[PDB]
Amino acid sequence: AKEIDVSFVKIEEVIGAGEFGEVYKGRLKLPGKREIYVAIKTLKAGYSEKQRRDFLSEASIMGQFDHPNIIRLEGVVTKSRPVMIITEFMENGALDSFLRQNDGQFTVIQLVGMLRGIAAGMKYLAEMNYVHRDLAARNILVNSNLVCKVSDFPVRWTAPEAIAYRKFTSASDVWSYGIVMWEVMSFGERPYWDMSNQDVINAIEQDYRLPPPMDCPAALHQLMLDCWQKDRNSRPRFAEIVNTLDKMIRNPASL
Numbered sequence: 001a002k003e004i005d006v007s008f009v010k011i012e013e014v015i016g017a018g019e020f021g022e023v024y025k026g027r028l029k030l031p032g033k034r035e036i037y038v039a040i041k042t043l044k045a046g047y048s049e050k051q052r053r054d055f056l057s058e059a060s061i062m063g064q065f066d067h068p069n070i071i072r073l074e075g076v077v078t079k080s081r082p083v084m085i086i087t088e089f090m091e092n093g094a095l096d097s098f099l100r101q102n103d104g105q106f107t108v109i110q111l112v113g114m115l116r117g118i119a120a121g122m123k124y125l126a127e128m129n130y131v132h133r134d135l136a137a138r139n140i141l142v143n144s145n146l147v148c149k150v151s152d153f154p155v156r157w158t159a160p161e162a163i164a165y166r167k168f169t170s171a172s173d174v175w176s177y178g179i180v181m182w183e184v185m186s187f188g189e190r191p192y193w194d195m196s197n198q199d200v201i202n203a204i205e206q207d208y209r210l211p212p213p214m215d216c217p218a219a220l221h222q223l224m225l226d227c228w229q230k231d232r233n234s235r236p237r238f239a240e241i242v243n244t245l246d247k248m249i250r251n252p253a254s255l
């Protein structure tokens, strides 16, 4: 929880809106240090003390992590009003909109590298006994070098036992990850397209699973299907997902 003097922060244009408030692009210039771009997360005007505490709890969770595929907390502004959370800036924004605006414009190996980064971030979260519960391409951010990082600290992304019995675990996080794999390899198609939420639940219970996206390697779609096994203990763990994607990257004939 590093405290940042607000005079070191220059707020520029709005780049997003979340549950808490607007997110801005900005510049952070600490004394003696090279300026960097940041995202500045703000809290909607008029917030109460309880809303302030809930907002800053995002920063306290984020500050526990230090991994190249988890969004980095630069610091917080809490000595002055309004409160702000300052994170690293991700030039290409959310992964789902990034892919939908770049349909077809990345190679399979680039997309696999994106997925490997997301899986490494999730492995790290799971090792720290953090269950994300909301993993989806809209909650992954992408930087200028196409590195993907988990952020956000929804029936069609949720494992069936999390829907039916409220059992959320890292294995339900792996189900969601398989949906993210399908989002990525389809360049941001909507999972299950225009099916209703109840139609999705009923179909999954009768063993429907999403088909391979166009031009998706068979081995990548099989890994999706492994993430979507009904029995949560049959799903691969994130450590195995990373190893599988690494082997695909090392042996690209397998794609």
Ligand SMILES: Nc1ncnc2c1ncn2[C@@H]1O[C@H](COP(=O)(O)OP(=O)(O)O)[C@@H](O)[C@H]1O
Residues within 6 Å of the ligand: 015, 016, 017, 018, 019, 020, 021, 022, 023, 039, 041, 042, 071, 087, 088, 089, 090, 091, 093, 094, 138, 141, 151, 152
């Ligand atoms: N680090 C970042 N870099 C670039 N865009 C970001 C960044 N963080 C958030 N955004 C944009 O702002 C949107 C809302 O962010 P979110 O984390 O949901 O806000 P909140 O502070 O309300 O939780 C994101 O979907 C994304 O478009």
